[PDB]
Amino acid sequence: LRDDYDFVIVGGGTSGLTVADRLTEAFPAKNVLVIEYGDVHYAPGTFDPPTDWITPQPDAPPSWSFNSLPNPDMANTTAFVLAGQVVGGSSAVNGMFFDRASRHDYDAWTAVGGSGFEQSSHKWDWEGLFPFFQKSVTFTEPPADIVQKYHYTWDLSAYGNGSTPIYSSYPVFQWADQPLLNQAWQEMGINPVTECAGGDKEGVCWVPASQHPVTARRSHAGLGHYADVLPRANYDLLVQHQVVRVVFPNGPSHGPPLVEARSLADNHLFNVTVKGEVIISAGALHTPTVLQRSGIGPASFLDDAGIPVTLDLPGVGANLQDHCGPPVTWNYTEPYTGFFPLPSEMVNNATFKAEAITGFDEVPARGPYTLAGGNNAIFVSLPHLTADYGAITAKIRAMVADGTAASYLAADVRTIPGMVAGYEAQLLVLADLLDNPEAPSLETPWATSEAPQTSSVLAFLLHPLSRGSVRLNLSDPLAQPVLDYRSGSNPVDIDLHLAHVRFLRGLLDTPTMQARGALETAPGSAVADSDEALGEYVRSHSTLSFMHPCCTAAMLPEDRGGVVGPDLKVHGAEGLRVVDMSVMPLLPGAHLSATAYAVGEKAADIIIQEWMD
Numbered sequence: 066l067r068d069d070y071d072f073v074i075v076g077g078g079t080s081g082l083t084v085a086d087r088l089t090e091a092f093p094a095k096n097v098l099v100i101e102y103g104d105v106h107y108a109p110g111t112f113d114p115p116t117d118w119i120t121p122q123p124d125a126p127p128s129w130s131f132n133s134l135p136n137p138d139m140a141n142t143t144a145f146v147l148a149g150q151v152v153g154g155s156s157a158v159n160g161m162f163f164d165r166a167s168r169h170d171y172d173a174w175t176a177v178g179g180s181g182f183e184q185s186s187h188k189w190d191w192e193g194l195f196p197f198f199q200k201s202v203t204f205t206e207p208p209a210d211i212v213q214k215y216h217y218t219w220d221l222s223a224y225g226n227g228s229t230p231i232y233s234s235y236p237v238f239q240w241a242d243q244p245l246l247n248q249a250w251q252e253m254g255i256n257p258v259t260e261c262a263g264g265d266k267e268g269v270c271w272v273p274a275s276q277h278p279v280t281a282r283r284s285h286a287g288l289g290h291y292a293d294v295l296p297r298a299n300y301d302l303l304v305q306h307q308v309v310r311v312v313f314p315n316g317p318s319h320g321p322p323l324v325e326a327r328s329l330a331d332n333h334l335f336n337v338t339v340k341g342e343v344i345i346s347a348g349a350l351h352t353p354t355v356l357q358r359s360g361i362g363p364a365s366f367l368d369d370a371g372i373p374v375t376l377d378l379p380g381v382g383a384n385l386q387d388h389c390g391p392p393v394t395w396n397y398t399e400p401y402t403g404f405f406p407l408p409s410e411m412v413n414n415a416t417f418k419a420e421a422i423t424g425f426d427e428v429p430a431r432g433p434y435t436l437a438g439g440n441n442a443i444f445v446s447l448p449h450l451t452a453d454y455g456a457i458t459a460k461i462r463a464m465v466a467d468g469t470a471a472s473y474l475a476a477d478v479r480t481i482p483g484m485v486a487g488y489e490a491q492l493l494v495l496a497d498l499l500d501n502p503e504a505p506s507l508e509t510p511w512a513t514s515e516a517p518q519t520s521s522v523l524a525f526l527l528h529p530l531s532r533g534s535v536r537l538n539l540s541d542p543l544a545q546p547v548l549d550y551r552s553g554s555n556p557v558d559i560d561l562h563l564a565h566v567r568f569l570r571g572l573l574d575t576p577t578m579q580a581r582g583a584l585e586t587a588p589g590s591a592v593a594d595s596d597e598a599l600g601e602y603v604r605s606h607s608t609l610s611f612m613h614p615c616c617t618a619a620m621l622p623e624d625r626g627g628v629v630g631p632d633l634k635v636h637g638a639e640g641l642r643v644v645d646m647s648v649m650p651l652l653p654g655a656h657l658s659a660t661a662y663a664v665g666e667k668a669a670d671i672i673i674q675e676w677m678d
């Protein structure tokens with residue numbers, strides 16, 4: 066471990082390793098150090114040997130497990146959330162669903178920053194982010210036989226001729242009843258989309274897997290941004306170390322700070338000297354933890370924590386958002402026939418599963434295990450799924466106009482004019498986005514419809530108005546934070562859930578599902594028809610997290626509660642940036658990992674262009 070470094074990156078995760086990669090290749094004379102809580106682990110993909118249709122990988126890398134506080138507005142249910150504890154971060158333990166949000170979701174970032182963000186040239190709208198999306202991954206056309214078998218569609222214009230060893234691929238396998246819902250979504254008027262990673266994604270979407278096109282092995286940041294670029298002499302990595310905080314010897318206006326690190330083996334604490342900048346990429350859950358212990362956070366929490374205030378930025382750990390939603394479930398009253406193979410074949414058929422195990426080891430990889438978690442989702446806009454009803458967005462706009470919107474934030478947040486102002490800007494922008502018929506409001510993925518385990522649809526609330534907190538355990542500040550999800554704390558989220566579930570129920574009415582005798586098992590017509598009963602149902606049967614927590618160090622002006630500018634520097638701190646999913650101001654209508662790379666690539670480009678002064 067060297068005397069000093071030019072760059073320290075806190076967290077060897079998805080964004081952090083892509084930043085560390087791009088910095089070391091651009092500045093061969095500058096030394097980068099990545100400090101990682103975890104270690105290097107082989108990363109099994111989703112549904113790899115010897116699992117059954119979606120069982121846990123026996124040799125999975127380590128992760129943090131989180132149980133949030135009870136969410137009273139969702140029947141006190143707890144949210145269960147994971148975070149990868151490994152070189153590669155969460156992308157090493159992903160479900161590998163590798164989509165991007167619509168162009169309008171990222172346009173929303175620029176709009177929510179407002180004019181306070183406009184004397185910078187770093188635009189995080191679609192036009193400013195799309196080139197880095199193309200840079201971030203290499204996509205590969207599937208074989209022709211696989212195309213004519215499963216009917217993948219795509220448009221290479223969405224990917225360009227990028228060549229970064231982070232792979233987006235379509236498996237050479239699908240379950241045999243994959244076309245079932247595909248046909249039924251079209252009978253609901255949801256239309257096929259040829260390519261959904263090129264910004265235009267409302268309709269029925271093919272989504273790729275973050276995995277190698279030949280071997281089907283998981284692609285994560287630890288390979289593509291770390292292992293695959295070594296040897297590289299200025300690219301250092303320190304494992305089994307927890308970065309405690311950053312310290313400014315002469316205050317935050319004289320930087321970069323020192324990185325105070327704790328060795329997880331022996332608890333030995335030390336400091337790393339930084340010449341250039343410190344980049345924090347500890348993730349949406351842990352970046353707030355690193356800045357809070359650095360005295361960079363809500364002044365009142367920091368006082369209650371016995372931590373001296375270095376920067377009073379109440380956005381640190383605030384504005385927590387995640388994807389969540391309740392299900393619609395059915396059985397079949399006729400036998401589920403004519404499909405081979407279905408997922409149950411893995412548990413019914415030793416021959417078939419033995420072959421799947423060995424098919425995965427052939428070159429190229431073959432059979433069921435080349436599949437990750439599935440490659441399909443609908444993304445339906447609020448106008449489309451409700452027949453242009455303006456009730457929800459009127460409620461949002463009114464709730465800002467009358468000033469009651471603030472009441473839905475936490476009691477130590479609604480009192481802060483900065484936070485109310487930024488929450489209000491979010492809601493109006495979200496109100497506009499949910500009025501855009503090309504902007505997804507509901508996501509529903511599927512790969513099979515075999516009953517009973519996969520005869521269900523989930524109603525992903527893509528753009529929640531509720532907001533939560535990531536805060537230090539005050540008993541053990543170095544332990545994992547407390548997550549207060551406050552799911553459903555803004556009531557428009559419940560209205561969205563009812564609209565989404567009620568749209569989804571139409572699935573069972575489709576000729577395709579009626580041919581199969583699909584019989585609704587939950588919520589049922591009785592519940593669905595009662596705003597009070599369906600409300601009760603979404604509040605107690607929703608999954609509170611699909612493991613996409615974000616926006617705890619939002620890219621917003623300080624007066625709107627943000628923590629970083631559009632250059633991703635922490636407001637009021639020189640030589641200190643954040644680059645991970647905590648910087649998004651609004652949660653995107655997508656799974657986050659592809660965005661995490663794109664954010665890493667653009668943040669690296671920003672950092673590079675300035676250090677070539």
Ligand SMILES: Cc1cc2nc3c(=O)[nH]c(=O)nc-3n(C[C@H](O)[C@H](O)[C@H](O)COP(=O)(O)OP(=O)(O)OC[C@H]3O[C@@H](n4cnc5c(N)ncnc54)[C@H](O)[C@@H]3O)c2cc1C
Nearest residue numbers: 076078079080102154155160161162308645646656657658
């Ligand atoms: C179970 C699960 C499944 C998912 N499935 C999908 C999916 O199918 N599709 C999708 O698009 N997204 C998915 N995601 C989410 C997506 O992968 C993440 O949002 C994204 O990878 C996060 O990137 P990041 O760089 O912000 O964080 P991470 O990649 O998690 O990076 C944080 C890193 O910092 C390290 N760290 C934490 N604290 C410290 C500290 N104090 N000092 C040093 N290092 C520290 C962590 O160990 C980790 O390496 C999933 C997430 C989970 C948890």
Ligand SMILES: *[C@@H]1O[C@H](CO)[C@@H](O[C@@H]2O[C@H](CO)[C@@H](O[C@@H]3O[C@H](CO)[C@@H](O)[C@H](O)[C@@H]3O)[C@H](O)[C@H]2NC(C)=O)[C@H](O)[C@H]1NC(C)=O
Nearest residue numbers: 311312313314315316323324325326333334335336337373
């Ligand atoms: C990492 O670097 C920081 C910055 O140098 C170290 O923090 C500094 O620690 C010194 C202790 O040597 C603190 O000074 C102390 O102040 C109290 C009262 O103010 C006084 O009673 C002590 O005698 C001593 O002078 C100093 O405040 C502190 N600096 C900051 C900005 O917090 C930190 O210890 C280093 N960490 C490790 C593990 O080396």
Ligand SMILES: *[C@@H]1O[C@H](CO)[C@@H](O[C@@H]2O[C@H](CO)[C@@H](O)[C@H](O)[C@H]2NC(C)=O)[C@H](O)[C@H]1NC(C)=O
Nearest residue numbers: 404405406410413414415416417418419420421
């Ligand atoms: C158990 O699974 C194996 C698949 O590995 C089945 O064997 C295949 O059956 C299909 C018929 O759907 C044929 O097209 C293939 O030629 C067979 N391949 C091999 C390698 O056997 C087998 O039929 C399954 N058993 C049952 C009872 O369904």
Ligand SMILES: *[C@@H]1O[C@H](CO)[C@@H](O)[C@H](O)[C@H]1NC(C)=O
Nearest residue numbers: 135136137138139140141142
């Ligand atoms: C939430 O917390 C506790 C449950 O043990 C109780 O205070 C409250 O009634 C709970 N709310 C609901 C709706 O269950």
Ligand SMILES: [Ca+2]
Nearest residue numbers: 111112434436
């Ligand atoms: Ca697999």
